[PDB]
Each structure stands twice: as structure tokens, then as C-alpha cells.
Amino acid sequence: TLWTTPDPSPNCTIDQERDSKLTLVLTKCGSQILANVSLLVVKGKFSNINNNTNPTDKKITVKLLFNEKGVLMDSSTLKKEYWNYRNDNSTVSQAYDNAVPFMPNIKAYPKPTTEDKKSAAKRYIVSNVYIGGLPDKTVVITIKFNAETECAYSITFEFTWAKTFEDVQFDSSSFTFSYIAQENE
Amino acid sequence: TLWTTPDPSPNCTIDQERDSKLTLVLTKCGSQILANVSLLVVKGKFSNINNNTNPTDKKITVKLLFNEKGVLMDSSTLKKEYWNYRNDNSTVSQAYDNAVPFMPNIKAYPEDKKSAAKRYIVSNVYIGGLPDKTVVITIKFNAETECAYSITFEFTWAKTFEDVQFDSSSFTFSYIAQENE
Amino acid sequence: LTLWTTPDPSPNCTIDQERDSKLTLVLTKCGSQILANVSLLVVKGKFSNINNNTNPTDKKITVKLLFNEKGVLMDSSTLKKEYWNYRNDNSTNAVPFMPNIKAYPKPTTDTSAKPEDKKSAAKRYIVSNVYIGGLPDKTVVITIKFNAETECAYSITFEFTWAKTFEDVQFDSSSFTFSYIAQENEDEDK
């Protein structure tokens, strides 16, 4: 298991710096990865969403980008702080993370470098997640795997709302999901 | 593995006593908890939902409250009896036993101000696995007083159902654990 | 404790035409629960450019996976047998990856009329929404019924359904995760 230790330490920079708290838990079920994501926006643009005085403010992306060794790159709007393995020994204080088996699968979700035949959607997840747990504030979570340039691997969260919000913090309800990938030989 | 035996023997007090049967499965892949929930109401208020006569009949909550030992309370709207390790051990009691690594994380669950929706899961289930009969399942982790931990199933619908047995499709979810033992 | 399609598989499904379509399903077995993940791409065929302006009734596609006593896949299935197993080659127990029969029993008209239903009608269903090339514009209902088919020991039955009248669309649905409950019962019953 490799996570954003389930405490707050702002660690993620959408509009302003340390902006926000994304709690993302990855847990390695052999072949498949089981993943949980809340996102809480402390300060910044999306601490007050208003689409009367900022209509366009209808979408936030937040990006994790990884190595050959699947370590988190700066070009990620997530900070390498408080992003490690937890084993019951204070491993998360260390940060020697070289965690390639937790990585979206190349064979499943390759880089999108385009007979005429290949899968647009295989590497998308798209559902709905709810602000404050309030069913009126319908938000479209979209998850993309290994879709970004400059990286071996790349998980992309991207929330999107059509209904115009009127002085709304971006707190999102948690979201469970799975992808695959590991070491190949 | 820690479950309400996948077969039906009623265990739930909505409206009437033993009203209905809840199917819930807690499997623990390490520090994360993968869970299944279906719900069939067999006698009473929800057994023939008619909102063309009894409108307010539009919501159903079912709570499980927990101890330091991770044990179910009398204050929980599901019955104690068959709640344990799956088949083999299922009779032998879970009491003296802790069940704390199945308990939702207590640290997990515009200022230093906290999250409102961190301890929510909010989506759609379907009565009959019919698209038309849209329900909205709302879970809420560790949000009940007078208890060490809490898991809280809320099922709402906007559509006025004419003669209908609440009979929820299976829904799948995770939540962060806490696995000292 | 993992059983799949290849993450990047060769056309492994007949829907419309022979070798029609390409189903990436991954079942991983977390103890007493099967974590699952399913994409569908349709390469050639009818559902490679669905055009609901010309064929209104083309608004469903069904993929069934009928199993054995021993959890082996069946000619009857719409998923071809060649590619399957976990990432080694012989073949198969394959049962411990099988939807539990007490939860999702085979549907028999031998059912008590005292209001104690052994299961619900829908307990075995899992109904939600996937999107065709992640474009939210294109809503797709996914529908998994468990053990719902006859002439088999155990079943899995992805049905895909769309309301909206597409034009020239190639059925390529977003990945969907779900769980079902596991059969794996220790033959020895104390």
C-alpha cells in the first residue's frame, strides 16, 4: 500500500500553491490496484466556486506523473511530500519510494501514440461524485491512465460541473476504483 | 473476510421488527476495505412502496454502530446474531475477539477547516436492476455520536413508485481501515 | 489468485460477426470477494459504427460467460476459450473465482411463498453508467447479472444499453470496476 497519509498536510497545487488536500489511497491486490480519492480545496480559486463572476471555472485537473521507477515527478500538481509506502515502522517518513508495480499497466493503458483499431476509452473511468455528499451538486470525476506526455506513467483526476455553482468550496465525496499493472517478463 | 451471511435470514429493523434482510460483505485487502451491499424489505412499509398514497415513504436509513473492540451495538438497526467470519467460524462469537481492522479510519473520518464529503460515498442503485427505478445510495463513515466507529446506509428516491418492493441492486465501495492488532 | 483476458488481448468475442470484438475483463480474488474490471472495444462488425438513424433497435449488445461445476468457460459463452487463465499457460480450480450460489442462486420456480425470499430479484444485478470514449455526452448503461443464465453451472452476463440515438459510433466503453461474492467453499465441512 502507497498513499497520501490519510491526514491533511496540503500537498497539491491546482490554482495557488498548497491550494488543496487530495487524500488518495492505492492498495495492491495482486493483479489489480484498488484506489480511493477524496479532494478538499483549502484556499484559492476553487475555495469559492462562483460561475456568475467566474463562469468558465467549471473544471479542475490534478495530475500525478511517474518514472521508469514510478516515482512522483514535480510536473505533477501533487507534491512528493507525504506520498510513500506505509509499512508499520514509519516508512512514510523515509521516502525512498521506487514503487513501479503500483503503476497503470502499459499493455492495458499504453501511451496514446495513434487497418484502424485502438481503444479511446479503456483508460478512462467516468462516473459522478458529489460535493459535501449533496446530490444536487453533481460533479463528473474523470480518471485517465498513462495518457500524459513526459512520463513513463500518469494518473489524471479531472472534476467537471455544468450547473453554475454559487459560492461553493470544492470538497468531493470519496470515490473507489480499480486499474491494473505490474512488472512484466 | 467478515459478513452478513450472503443468504437472507432477516437481520434489519426498518418500520416493522425484523422488517427486511441486509446483505453486506467486508473483505480487507490490507489497509483498504472492499465492501458489497444489497437490501430486500420483505414485510411492512417499504415492502409495497406506494408514494401515490403514502408519499413521505421515500427514504430508508440502516445504521451499524461499533465499539473499541469493533463490536456491533444494540443501537444498530441490524441484528447481532449471524455477524462474523464467513462460513467455518461464523457461529463461534466475535465478542472477546477484536474486529478493529474492519473499522473505518478515525483519522480519515477556507481554513484549517475539515472535509464535509471525505466520509461520504454517493451514487445510484436500482430496484430490480431496472434503470427507470433510480434510487440514490448515500453511505456516511464515522458520523454517529455515542460510538467508537459507524457505517450508515441511506436510500432515497425522487420518482413516485406505484406498488414496488424495495429490492436494491448490489453496490460496491472501499474505505480506509486501521490495522493495529 | 487472478484470472483474465490479456490486458491487451486479440479479438476474443463474437457479438455480430466471428471474432467481432475485444473484451478486457480482469478478475482478481481478494479472499472472499472477486474484484473485477471490464472494458469493451468492438473492432469490426455492426457495433463498430452503430448508426441509430438507420437501425433504431440496435441499442443493446450482450456478452455471456457460462461456466462449469469446475468453473471452465463453455463454447456457449460469447467469450472464446483460447485466452483466459492467470498469466501462465495450461488451463483448469477456476471455481474459487465464481459468483457465490447462495447469494446469486440459479433461478428456480421452487421458491417459498412465506415472505422469506432467500435472495432479492436484483441482489445479483449491478447496474450503473459507463461512457463511450470517456465522452460524458455518450451515456451507456452497463448491467451485470450473476448466475442468471440456464444450461450452465455459473454465469456472468455484461449487457450494454444506450437511450441516446448515436450516429456512426464504435462501441468503445470506459473501464468499470465492481465486486461480486466468492464461491470458494472448503469441501471439508467440520
DSSP string, B13-47: -SSSTT-EEEEEEEE--TTEEEEEEEEEE-SSTTT
- The answer to whether B119 and B140 have CB atoms below 8 angstroms apart is yes
Q: Which residues pair with C101 in a beta bridge?
A: none
Tell me the residue type at C39. Answer: S
**Dihedral sign (CA A142, A143, A149, A154):** positive
Q: How many CA atoms lie within 13 A of B39 on its CB side?
A: 26
Q: Which of C120, C127, C179 sits opposite B34 (nearest CB)?
A: C179
- The answer to whether C126 and B129 have CB atoms below 8 angstroms apart is yes
* C114 Cβ contact list (under 8 Å, min separation 6): none
**Dihedral sign (CA B164, C160, B125, B159):** negative
For B80-89, b/e burial (b = at least 16 CB within 10 A) is eeebbbbbee
Q: How many angstroms separate the CA of residue B65 from the nearest CA in chain A?
A: 20
> Residue C95's closest CA among C26, C179, C24, C182?
C182
Dihedral angle computed from the Cα positions of residues B122, B127, B129 and B135, in that order, rounded to the nearest 10 degrees = -30
3-state secondary structure of B79: coil
- The answer to whether C7 and A123 have CB atoms below 8 angstroms apart is no
C8 contacts in chain A (CB < 8 Å)? 107-108, 110
**DSSP output for A96-147:** ----GGGS--TTTS----------SSTTEEE--EEBTT-TTSEEEEEEEES-
Strand pairing report for A138-145 and A153-160 = antiparallel
Dihedral angle computed from the Cα positions of residues C29, C34, C35 and C41, in that order, rounded to the nearest 10 degrees = 110
Distance of CA B93 to the CA centre of its chain: 21
Interatomic CA distance for residues A159 and A139, integer angstroms:
6
Chains that touch C (3 or more CB pairs under 8 A): A, B
Residue A92 backbone dihedrals phi, psi, to 5 degrees:
-75, -25
> Residue B71's closest CA among B4, B149, B168, B166?
B149
A140 burial type by CB count under 10 A (0-12 exposed, 13-18 middle, 19+ buried): middle
- The answer to whether B31 and A1 have CB atoms below 8 angstroms apart is yes
Instruction: Say if the Cβ atoms of B169 and C100 lie within 8 Å.
Output: no
Q: Grid coordinates standing for A164?
A: 453554475
Q: CA separation (Å) from A133 to A137, A164, C45?
A: 8, 17, 42
Is A125 in the C-facing interface, judged by CB distances under 8 Å?
Answer: yes
Instruction: Cell 482478481: give the residue.
Output: C28
Tell me the residue type at B71. Answer: V
> Residue B118's closest CA among A42, A40, A137, A14?
A40
Element (H, E) at A91: helix A91-94
3-state secondary structure of A14: coil
Instruction: Cell 432477516: give the residue.
Output: B10
Instruction: Cell 441511506: give the residue.
Output: B154
DSSP 8-state secondary structure symbol assigned to residue A93: H
* C100 Cβ contact list (under 8 Å, min separation 6): B6, C180, C181, C182, C183
Is C145 in the B-facing interface, judged by CB distances under 8 Å?
Answer: yes
Could you state, in order of their start, the residue ranges of all structural domains in chain B?
A: 2-176
Element (H, E) at A94: helix A91-94
Residue A49 backbone dihedrals phi, psi, to 5 degrees:
-75, 110
Instruction: Say if the Cβ atoms of A108 and C7 lie within 8 Å.
Output: yes
- The answer to whether A169 and A41 have CB atoms below 8 angstroms apart is yes
In chain B the beta strands, taken as DSSP E runs, fall at 2-4, 20-27, 32-41, 59-66, 83-84, 120-126, 134-140, 149-156, 171-176
| The Cα angle at residue C175 between residues B2 and B153, in degrees rounded to 5 | 35
Which residues precede gaps in chain C, with C-N > 2.5 A? 92
Q: Which of A29, A122, A140 sits opposite C175 (nearest CB)?
A: A122
SS3 content of chain B, % helix, strand, coil (to 5): 0, 40, 60
How would CATH label the architecture of B2-176?
Sandwich (2.60)
Q: How many angstroms separate the CA of residue C147 from the nearest CA in chain A?
A: 23
Resolution expressed in Å: 3.1
* B120-126: strand order across its sheet: B59-66, B149-156, B134-140, B120-126
| The Cα angle at residue A101 between residues C80 and A33, in degrees rounded to 5 | 60
- The answer to whether A62 and A22 have CB atoms below 8 angstroms apart is yes
B118 burial type by CB count under 10 A (0-12 exposed, 13-18 middle, 19+ buried): buried
Interatomic CA distance for residues C173 and C178, integer angstroms:
15
Q: Grid coordinates standing for B112?
A: 484549517
Which site among A36, A126, A156 would you substitute to test the C interface, given the most C Cβ atoms closer than 10 Å to its Cβ?
A: A126
Q: How many angstroms separate the CA of residue B74 from the nearest CA in chain C?
A: 24
- The answer to whether B33 and A25 have CB atoms below 8 angstroms apart is no
Q: Grid coordinates standing for A177?
A: 476504483
Q: Grid coordinates standing for A159?
A: 472534476
B112 contacts in chain A (CB < 8 Å)? 8
For A120-132, b/e burial (b = at least 16 CB within 10 A) is bbbbbbbbbbbbb
- The answer to whether B78 and A133 have CB atoms below 8 angstroms apart is no
Interatomic CA distance for residues B106 and A102, integer angstroms:
25
For A81-119, b/e burial (b = at least 16 CB within 10 A) is ebbbbbeeeeebeeeebebbebbbbbebbbeeeeeeeeb
3-state secondary structure of B4: strand
Instruction: Say if the Cβ atoms of A133 and B156 lie within 8 Å.
Output: no
Interatomic CA distance for residues A46 and A38, integer angstroms:
15
- The answer to whether B135 and B126 have CB atoms below 8 angstroms apart is yes
Residue B25 backbone dihedrals phi, psi, to 5 degrees:
-130, 120
Which site among C33, C35, C104, C120 would you substitute to test the B interface, given the most B Cβ atoms closer than 10 Å to its Cβ?
A: C120
Interatomic CA distance for residues B94 and A170, integer angstroms:
40
Tell me the residue type at A74. Answer: D
Tell me the residue type at B129. Answer: G
* C82 Cβ contact list (under 8 Å, min separation 6): C12
Q: Which of A6, A21, A29 sits opposite B29 (nearest CB)?
A: A29
* A89 Cβ contact list (under 8 Å, min separation 6): none
Is B29 in the A-facing interface, judged by CB distances under 8 Å?
Answer: yes
Which site among B17, B21, B172, B174 would you substitute to test the C interface, given the most C Cβ atoms closer than 10 Å to its Cβ?
A: B172
Interatomic CA distance for residues B112 and B100, integer angstroms:
29
B132 burial type by CB count under 10 A (0-12 exposed, 13-18 middle, 19+ buried): exposed
How would CATH label the architecture of A2-180?
Sandwich (2.60)
> Residue C142's closest CA among C160, C126, C125?
C160
**DSSP output for chain C:** -EEES-SS----B-SSSTT-BEEEEEEEEETTEEEEEEEEE--SSSTTSB-TTT-TT--EEEEE----TT----TTSSB-SSS-SSSSSS----STTSB-TTTS----S---SSS--SS-SSTTEEEEEEEBTT-TTSEEEEEEEES--SSSSS-EEEEEE--S--SSB--EEEEEEEEEEB----S---
Rg of chain B taking only CA atoms, in angstroms: 17
* A99 Cβ contact list (under 8 Å, min separation 6): A2, A69, A70, A71, A85
C172 contacts in chain A (CB < 8 Å)? 119-122
> Residue A25's closest CA among B147, B45, B118?
B118
Residue B150 backbone dihedrals phi, psi, to 5 degrees:
-160, 140
- A90 dihedral zone (left: phi>0; alpha: psi -120 to 50; beta): left
Experimental method: X-ray
- The answer to whether C88 and C1 have CB atoms below 8 angstroms apart is no
Interatomic CA distance for residues B94 and B86, integer angstroms:
12
Is C53 in the B-facing interface, judged by CB distances under 8 Å?
Answer: no
Is A94 in the B-facing interface, judged by CB distances under 8 Å?
Answer: no
Is A27 in the C-facing interface, judged by CB distances under 8 Å?
Answer: no
Is B143 in the A-facing interface, judged by CB distances under 8 Å?
Answer: no
Q: CA separation (Å) from A23 to A37, A181, B45?
A: 6, 21, 40
Q: Grid coordinates standing for B22?
A: 441486509
Interatomic CA distance for residues C83 and A156, integer angstroms:
31
- The answer to whether B91 and C86 have CB atoms below 8 angstroms apart is no
Find the residue in B nearest to C144 (Cα). Answer: B129
Instruction: Say if the Cβ atoms of C175 and A142 lie within 8 Å.
Output: no
